[model samples]
Target chain A: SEARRRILETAWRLIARRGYHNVRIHDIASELGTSNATIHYHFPSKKDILLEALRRNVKLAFDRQVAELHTIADARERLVRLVELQLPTPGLLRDEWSVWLQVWTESTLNPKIRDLYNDAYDRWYQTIAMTIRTGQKQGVFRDQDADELATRLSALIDGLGIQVLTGKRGCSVDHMRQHLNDFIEHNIVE
Target chain B: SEARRRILETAWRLIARRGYHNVRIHDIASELGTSNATIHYHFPSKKDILLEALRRNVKLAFDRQVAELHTIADARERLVRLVELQLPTPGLLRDEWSVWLQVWTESTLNPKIRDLYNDAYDRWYQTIAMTIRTGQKQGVFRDQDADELATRLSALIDGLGIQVLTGKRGCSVDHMRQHLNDFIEHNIVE
Candidate 1:
């Protein structure tokens, strides 16, 4: 159990530091004062290790946010909270961003990866769509098409994330918050 | 002049086939039935070869559109034309699209490549912004922020582009066109 935890922690650290492609099983083992045999004893392959790491990281983040969403009764506040969670933060390093981009790029070539990519995207959309539907029920959002609006909002978030990753837009983190606020105010029904 | 053209063409072919990273000067020379000396003679290095290739391809596309935009009087039509030009048509190959994605990925890491990326992006954004501003002037569009609207529209285009490139959407050319039309009609002020 300790070895597995150490492997996962080291994988995340190296992935966060030098990207998924640059980090390897050997690197993780070496960093953890262990052997490749120990790593393979727990995980079958490199992708298997990465899959676990990615799933755990995303699950932890999503679960934490989802728990917080239940406490915020106001659907509008929930929607804003969701956007805030989606926006890129300064803590996201270049390597992590690079790895995300790489996965997206590979999704184009591989059907399995593409399915994983789609599933991840659909989960995010579903979260926002559910919030929008709740808001509509509470008379806080427009009764228009929730799915379409969710797609648009997701596109906006994805676009902004790409811009932030590319460093093309250098707005302060506060500026990003303000931009999302303006978008929500203008688009969501008052 | 012939040698230069041959080198550029070779670079384009290799880039389009194997992406930017997999391309090498030796590979280009071998493809062209020439020596590395010939490639070095035409272009100083691999980066120079890539830059020149990108500049030429981008300039060719940009210049043609600019010239055509001058003749087009209506801004909405111009915006539509811009979208039409970007949509992947029958002639567009996966290899070329993959190469473009590769270059864009690299741009995130390299400042010099980022400059080229900015120039290309600005050219496209200016075209869209100009169209939106003209629509505002002609009373065809609502009094909205042209820059912001353009930014959103650009994001839609990019998000859609990725979808098409990854084959997750738009199996038919008609489907792609219809999708673009829907977004354009929905977003533009009547």
Candidate 2:
């Protein structure tokens, strides 16, 4: 299990810096001070590694991000924290965002990855929707279909993240945070 | 100029399908029934070809999309049309969206492309801002900083485009269109 975890982590980091199309099993092996035969023993192929990396990322998000949301008492603040946690601010989180960006592009070309990507997003959307439902029940959010509202808010976060991560002018971390905060206050908050 | 145009159009299509890193000058040459020397004569390197392809896409947008906006009588409808025109509905426009996705990913790794991308987005944001400014003059849009409003709207469109183009569940062309229209109606329209 430890060896498998290390391999997936190395694969994810490499995929984040270099694109999936550019990364190879050999690269992952060398990064981990191992051999191609060893990497193959753990994962059948590069595609397997890619899928596992994606699954590991989803698991990490649930553990690191969603789990923390449980501790926040207010649903409004929980929703805000969800966006805040995904800001991609120039480190490990940023690299993770890059990996997801590649996954999104890959999903368009590979049906299998698309299915996995969609499933991951379904959970992400549900997280947002559930928070909205809680907030609505608490009478702190607007009256709307929680699922639909979650879709809109998630899309907004993604769009702003692309600009901010790509270094588009006028789109900084502060900029993204402000837009999301204003979105909560104006559209979601009671 | 004709040969250059053909090379760029071919390169754009290839990049859309195979991704930027996966494409080679030889591939573009062969696709055009030419030689590597012929392609090199026109483009010094693959990177040059990439820049030119991105520029061509921007020029095409202005020619095909922006010019048509002149015929619209209402600013609100014009803005709506702008977003509508960009729907990635599995055709040439969808191909264009794929190319932009590659560009967004490339921007993070390449400084030169990032500069060009930022400049391109500056123009995109301005177009949205200009439309909102026009709507404000006609007393149709809600009063706000036109630039800021444009930034918000553009981000939402881009975010939605990412999901729709990637085939995310519950994020089809119709789904994207409804969200954009709703955003405009709920937030922008008076």
Candidate 3:
């Protein structure tokens, strides 16, 4: 168990520092100064040792986000926080954005990661849509499909995150928050 | 020279269809009905041939978008039209999406490629920032910073574009256009 933990931790760090495609098991072994046998004894494949562990880790983060989102008192404010939470902080965004990009492309090729992303995507999608629905029912927001609204909002956050990561010459977290707030206020205000 | 040109063209196609990560030198060689030796003869390595061609194509794509943005047939349409071009269209987009992701991850690891992206992103930022500045001066957009708005809006497009690639489901060109229009009408527009 201790060894398994070490391998997963090492793999996650590698994904963060090195692009997912750029990382190999040899690098993980070298990082931990362990042998190939030690790694293989615990995990049969890199895909298992990496993406699966990542899946469980993200599931926890996703659930935490959903639970925390539910605790917000103002449903409309919940909408605002939704955008903020989905993005990485300004300092780490450039690096973290690559990790997230690797995860997306991997999902297209790997079914387990596909399901992993699907699970996470579904959780936030529903949570945001529900917040929108609650606001609509309270007559605090205009009528519209909550799911579609969530998709558009979520999409913007995703795209913006990538842009911010690719180059910060024209982006900042504060500006992102401003854009999200403006779009939401203009789109949903009573 | 002709053979070298064919090799470069094949590399671009593979990058688009299979993604940068998935495109191997062998794949490019096989697709061109050639051998690895032939590929290497024309170019020192796959990275050189592939990245150079892509660097050029991406620039053309960037320039095309900027030029097209300027030629909008109706007023108040450039902003939305600009967003539309950043995304993939049907066969073209679905295939190109993975390539975009591949290159994004590459950009993080490869400084040279990152510079390439920074160049393309800046073209749009200043180009679209000017679009917003004009609209703002014309009393169409809000009185926020135009470049900030460009970053945010472009981020949304980039993010939404990724979700579609990730198979978030129910996303199409029409839906993308609708979201873009709604955000502009509500937030970008005064």
**What lDDT would each prediction earn against the true structure?**
0.70, 0.85, 0.72
Worst 10 residues of 2 chain A by lDDT: A59-68
lDDT accuracy of residue A136 in candidate 3: 94
Q: How well does candidate 1 reproduce the true complex, by DockQ?
A: 0.42
Q: lDDT tens digits, residues B1-190, model 2?
A: 9998898889999988987777888898889999999999989988898798789778877787757798998999899999888788777888888888888887878898889888888888888899999999999999988877887888888888888877786578998899889889988998
- For residues A67-137, could you state the per-residue lDDT of candidate 2 as single tens digits? 77989989888888988887888888788788788877777787888898889888888889999999999
Candidate 1 structure, TM-score to reference: 0.83
* Model 1, CA-based lDDT: 0.70
Residue-by-residue lDDT tens digits, candidate 3, A103-123 = 887765677777777777787
Off by over 4 Å in 1: A12-17, A21-57, A93-96, A169-172, B1-17, B22-57, B90-97, B169-180
Model 1, residue pairs in steric clash: none
What is candidate 2's fraction of native contacts? 0.66
Model 1 chain B: lowest-lDDT 10 consecutive positions? B167-176
Q: Provide the clashing-pair count of each candidate structure.
A: 0, 0, 6
